[PDB]
Amino acid sequence: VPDYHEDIHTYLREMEVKCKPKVGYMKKQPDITNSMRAILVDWLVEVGEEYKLQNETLHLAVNYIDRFLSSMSVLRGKLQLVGTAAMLLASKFEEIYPPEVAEFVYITDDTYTKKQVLRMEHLVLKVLTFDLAAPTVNQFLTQYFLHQQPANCKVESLAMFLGELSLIDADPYLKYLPSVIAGAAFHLALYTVTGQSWPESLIRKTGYTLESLKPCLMDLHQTYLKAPQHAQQSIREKYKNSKYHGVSLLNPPETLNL
Amino acid sequence: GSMENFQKVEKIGEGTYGVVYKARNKLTGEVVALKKIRLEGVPSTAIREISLLKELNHPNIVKLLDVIHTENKLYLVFEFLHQDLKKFMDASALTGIPLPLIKSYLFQLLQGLAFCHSHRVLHRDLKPENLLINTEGAIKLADFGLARAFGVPVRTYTHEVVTLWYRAPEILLGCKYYSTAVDIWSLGCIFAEMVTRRALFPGDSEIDQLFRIFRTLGTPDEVVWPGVTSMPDYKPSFPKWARQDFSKVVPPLDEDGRSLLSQMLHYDPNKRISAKAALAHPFFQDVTKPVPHLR
Numbered sequence: 001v002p003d004y005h006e007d008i009h010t011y012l013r014e015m016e017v018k019c020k021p022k023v024g025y026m027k028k029q030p031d032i033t034n035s036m037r038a039i040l041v042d043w044l045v046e047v048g049e050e051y052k053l054q055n056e057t058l059h060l061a062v063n064y065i066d067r068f069l070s071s072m073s074v075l076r077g078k079l080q081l082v083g084t085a086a087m088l089l090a091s092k093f094e095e096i097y098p099p100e101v102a103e104f105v106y107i108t109d110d111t112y113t114k115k116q117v118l119r120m121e122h123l124v125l126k127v128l129t130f131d132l133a134a135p136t137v138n139q140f141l142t143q144y145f146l147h148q149q150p151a152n153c154k155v156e157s158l159a160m161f162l163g164e165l166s167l168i169d170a171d172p173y174l175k176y177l178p179s180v181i182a183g184a185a186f187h188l189a190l191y192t193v194t195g196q197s198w199p200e201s202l203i204r205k206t207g208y209t210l211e212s213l214k215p216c217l218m219d220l221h222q223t224y225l226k227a228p229q230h231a232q233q234s235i236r237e238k239y240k241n242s243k244y245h246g247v248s249l250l251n252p253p254e255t256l257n258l
Numbered sequence: 259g260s261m262e263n264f265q266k267v268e269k270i271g272e273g274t275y276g277v278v279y280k281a282r283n284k285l286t287g288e289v290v291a292l293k294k295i296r297l298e299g300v301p302s303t304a305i306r307e308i309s310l311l312k313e314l315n316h317p318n319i320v321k322l323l324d325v326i327h328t329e330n331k332l333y334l335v336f337e338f339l340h341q342d343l344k345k346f347m348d349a350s351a352l353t354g355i356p357l358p359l360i361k362s363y364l365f366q367l368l369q370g371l372a373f374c375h376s377h378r379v380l381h382r383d384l385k386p387e388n389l390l391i392n393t394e395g396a397i398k399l400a401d402f403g404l405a406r407a408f409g410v411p412v413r414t415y416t417h418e419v420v421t422l423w424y425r426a427p428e429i430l431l432g433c434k435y436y437s438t439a440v441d442i443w444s445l446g447c448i449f450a451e452m453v454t455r456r457a458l459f460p461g462d463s464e465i466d467q468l469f470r471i472f473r474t475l476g477t478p479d480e481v482v483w484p485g486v487t488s489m490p491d492y493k494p495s496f497p498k499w500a501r502q503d504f505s506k507v508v509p510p511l512d513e514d515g516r517s518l519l520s521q522m523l524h525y526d527p528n529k530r531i532s533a534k535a536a537l538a539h540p541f542f543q544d545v546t547k548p549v550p551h552l553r
């Protein structure tokens with residue numbers, strides 16, 4: 001379409017391997033669990049809602065957290081601080097008008113001081129060596145959306161919703177690359193709304209087929225089916241809004257016909 | 259890498275955070291530029307500048323060697339280049355810069371920019387002050403303080419971008435979406451400036467800037483630029499100037515150079531040439547790498 005669409009996709013595919021957190025880091029974390037991580041990410045979704053942040057900002061913040069926790073043991077009483085600094089960093093990187101630091105101190109219910117947030121920001125930067133331009137599920141989805149025939153707002157919003165749901169559950173989603181999760185989310189959105197499938201123009205673009213997407217797709221399908229019963233509900237609430245065409249109210253398909 | 263190994267030589271720039279010093283590595287002998295950033299936490303501009311610079315390794319992009327990251331100070335260590343293009347043009351005031359050098363510089367800039375665009379980075383402040391030249395004939399993009407990582411397709415980014423003289427018409431007219439084409443506009447303005455040795459469109463306000471562009475390229479209509487009259491800051495009252503003969507815009511420029519300039523200054527961002535496509539323009543058939551004729 002432009003120049004650079006192919007060059008950019010290729011580059012993001014290289015960088016997603018380099019920016020990937022360690023699959024099994026939670027096992028090496030003595031004091032925190034997948035469940036506590038789910039509570040943090042869900043809270044971040046709320047924060048994103050309250051300050052009207054981009055979805056990209058959310059995806060970036062979660063990437064920073066998972067990479068940080070891939071090498072830094074953290075106590076449960078400190079997880080939220082890591083999360084708050086990460087959302088602050090994501091905001092400065094991605095937002096036209098990020099919220100002020102005082103506002104990030106505010107949304108932690110005075111759990112931490114301003115100086116703690118600022119010192120944690122510094123530490124996060126050191127640990128990530130200032131490498132903040134990470135590929136996200138979101139960045140892959142917007143590229144895949146250009147292959148719709150024709151464009152469909154419901155498909156786009158639902159795919160975004162499904163991609164967002166994957167952020168909550170480190171098991172199983174930490175083992176999948178963002179481009180793969182995006183593939184599964186887009187097929188599942190397309191199939192739910194229009195009955196269409198992963199298009200072969202995306203097979204040409206990505207090299208992914210429904211066969212290669214199947215492991216992620218089966219997980220995502222189950223996540224979608226089980227969504228209303230999940231302990232964390234901020235994403236479902238968020239995606240009730242007309243902003244996202246209320247796609248969280250659409251009914252998941254019973255089978256994928258594979 | 260740490261501050262003991264470096265010996266400050268002289269101040270070579272004033273920034274915003276914000277003092278650039280020439281320094282010598284005492285152990286290796288390497289001459290460097292030290293950009294100091296004073297420490298709302300780490301500024302968003304430094305966060306982006308550092309993260310983006312770390313990804314961009316290209317011979318026509320300034321090299322970020324190291325980041326010295328302490329309690330109250332952030333030091334960015336860059337490769338030292340002798341001069342910026344703005345000062346160079348001033349030193350050649352009378353009697354000009356040779357066409358072969360201009361061609362070489364433009365060819366190199368387009369290389370640097372295409373690399374940026376290929377790695378989803380918009381520069382958003384291309385101007386002669388921010389382009390650095392060495393004694394070997396190299397020129398490099400510098401100052402990524404306004405840069406950002408863009409998405410495909412783009413969404414709405416910061417409006418207040420690109421210093422006025424080099425700012426594209428889609429920004430001036432308030433389009434919700436701008437993209438790589440804005441960096442190409444700036445480069446076209448710089449190309450013209452290297453040839454004529456004066457700024458192409460030196461307005462003192464947004465409206466003044468638009469009118470200067472219109473008097474040179476013609477007032478855009480739906481024919482030349484579909485959608486233009488629906489743009490937020492478009493006014494039907496705009497005076498309607500005729501486009502002028504390009505041989506009069508930059509008289510010393512020959513047919514291939516005029517062709518390339520017109521493609522870089524196309525109104526419609528869709529039709530404006532990419533950095534990648536411009537590398538194959540006939541203007542560059544005879545391109546070499548002359549050394550800068552000065553110091």
Ligand SMILES: Nc1ncnc2c1ncn2[C@@H]1O[C@H](COP(=O)(O)OP(=O)(O)OP(=O)(O)O)[C@@H](O)[C@H]1O
Nearest residue numbers: 270271272273274278291336337338339342387401
């Ligand atoms: N690596 C370098 N080698 C030589 N000179 C440099 C280098 N980096 C910066 N300078 C000089 O310092 C000036 C300011 O640095 P830079 O443009 O990177 O940051 P800035 O804060 O945006 O500066 P300004 O506010 O003057 O535009 C440059 O225009 C240049 O003349």
Ligand SMILES: [Mg+2]
Nearest residue numbers: 026029030032
């Ligand atoms: Mg554990």
Ligand SMILES: [Mg+2]
Nearest residue numbers: 387388400401
């Ligand atoms: Mg500058």
